[PDB]
């Protein structure tokens, strides 16, 4: 009906708790995943003889996980209320950053890589972090808890979203943010930005994917498209929306226990992938090969491939 | 602390001896009386209630009135006069007023933990509250 056939897939076991997030390295060789077990998951993935290994040292469950553009380092946000800097290929991590009053909501690297990484904490903290200086960048507070915070492609802007029920645009290098762009509604299922930088795709807790095209330069404050048809979160959940720039695609999780694939520019979605025993927490898309990482509450990562 | 060990405790225990003697008399009187009133599991309530009364008396003497020396308090704790675990949970934020240690047991319950005697009356239903089968004890009026 919707999905096309079945095709082979890879099931990744070993996660004690529900997987919080899933991501892949820029080279596509390894894929790391975070979960409630407070142990990062390194994976030899892109084809399977094996995954990679298990990473430890997190004092609490990792809320978010991401990899640096270089691939040798990665950042993670955990309930330990400390920014997690991890070196991986060296056998041990990077450094542990402190100063968060509450648990770290999300941590993502910027366009400068290890130089600065945008992060936020459920206390409502929106803060850039310098790393290689053995100290962060700067701290800021806007309204309320920011669910997701990520820097733009030019590293000069930082987009964030959370319980504040608004689209958060932040200017950074000016020691102040950018603008607050929101319609009339309150929902946050997550926040995301496209790779082109001309639009941002945020997840709405009403089960409504909101793609907004505004972009820098000429004033717009416009939108992109309204994606629907799949329920991302039933009541309250954190879903990481990762779009697939290959062709045109948008990947997201769902509370229906099915991976959510959405085509956008066609004014309709893509496909729904069943086979998950629980609600999908996060999904990823490999740039090199058409593979998608499936992280769900079932603690089993399902990586699909299109042939 | 009625055992045969060689102690010669400080005079504080000699001054607090009548209270422990009355508690032991009430414990023996409660343990020597069966129940014909068609109650099986409810017969163990006054034993745990009296034990919590003695533990609250020792903890109230050492940690509030300060009328007992640290050596006498350690001799009473190591002598079996009071429960060290119940007093440990009473000193921290775990329990300010504790009924019994069995109510906090997670594996003792079929599904879940935290016997309803530990739930506040705010969220809990006053009609179905009644009393705990295991613990019971603390609280009277409604």
């Amino acid at each position: 009906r919707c999905s096309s056939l079945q095709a082979p897939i890879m099931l990744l076991s070993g996660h004690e708790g529900e997987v919080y997030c899933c991501k892949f390295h820029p080279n596509g060789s390894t894929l790391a995943s975070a979960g409630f077990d407070r142990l990062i998951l390194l994976w030899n993935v892109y084809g399977d003889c094996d995954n990679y290994a298990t990473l430890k040292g997190h004092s609490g469950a990792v809320m978010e996980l991401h990899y640096n553009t270089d691939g040798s380092m990665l950042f993670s946000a955990s309930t330990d209320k400390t920014v997690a800097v991890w070196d991986s290929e060296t056998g041990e991590r990077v450094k542990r950053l402190k100063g968060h009053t509450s648990f770290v909501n999300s941590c993502y690297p910027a366009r400068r890589g290890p130089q600065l990484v945008c992060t936020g904490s459920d206390d409502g903290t929106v803060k850039l972090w310098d790393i290689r200086k053995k100290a962060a960048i700067q701290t800021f507070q806007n309204t309320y808890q920011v669910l997701a915070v990520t820097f733009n492609d030019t590293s000069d802007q930082i987009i964030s979203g959370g319980i504040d029920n608004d689209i958060k645009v932040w200017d950074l290098r000016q020691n102040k943010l950018t603008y607050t762009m929101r319609g009339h509604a309150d929902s946050v299922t997550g926040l995301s930005l496209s790779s082109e930088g001309s639009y941002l795709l945020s997840n709405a807790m009403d089960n409504t994917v909101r793609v907004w095209d505004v972009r820098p330069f000429a004033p717009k404050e416009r939108c992109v498209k309204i994606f629907q048809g799949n329920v991302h979160n039933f009541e309250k959940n954190l879903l990481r929306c990762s779009w697939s720039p290959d062709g045109s695609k948008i990947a997201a999780g769902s509370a229906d226990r099915f991976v959510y694939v959405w085509d956008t520019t066609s004014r309709r979605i893509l496909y729904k992938l069943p086979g998950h025993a629980g609600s999908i927490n996060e999904v990823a898309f490999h740039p090199d090969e058409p593979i998608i990482i499936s992280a769900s509450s079932d603690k089993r990562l399902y990586m699909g491939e299109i042939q | 602390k009625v055992k045969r060990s060689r102690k010669a405790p400080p005079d504080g225990w000699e001054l607090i001896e009548p209270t422990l003697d009355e508690l032991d008399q009430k414990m023996r009187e409660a343990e020597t009386e069966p129940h014909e009133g068609k109650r099986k599991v409810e017969s163990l309530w006054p034993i745990f209630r009296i034990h919590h009364q003695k533990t609250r008396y020792i903890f109230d003497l050492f940690y509030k009135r300060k009328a007992i020396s640290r050596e006498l308090y350690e001799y009473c704790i190591k002598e079996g006069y009071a429960d060290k675990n119940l007093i440990a949970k009473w000193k921290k934020q775990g329990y300010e007023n504790l009924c019994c240690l069995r109510c906090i047991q997670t594996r003792d319950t079929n599904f879940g933990t935290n016997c309803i005697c530990r739930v506040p009356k705010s969220k809990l239903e006053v009609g179905r509250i009644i009393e705990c089968t295991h613990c019971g004890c603390r609280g009277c009026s409604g």
Partner: protein, 87 residues
Amino acid sequence: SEEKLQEKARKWQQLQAKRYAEKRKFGFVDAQKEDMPPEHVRKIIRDHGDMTNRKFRHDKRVYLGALKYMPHAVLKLLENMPMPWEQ
């Protein structure tokens, strides 16, 4: 929606705080075994245990398990040896 922002901010603080209320990595420990009153369990159990009648009627099979386990009393009694060297 300022009132909904404050009320939704408190409900969200109790929400994310409720998710963080676990404070256990892959689960937590269990209840540690504590010593019960000796006269209560000893005197009450052994007092109502041997009476049988309708009090131990449900305890019947439990006593069949007691008698059904030999090594408990053997290894317990043989394992308890105050010895003449002390009192």
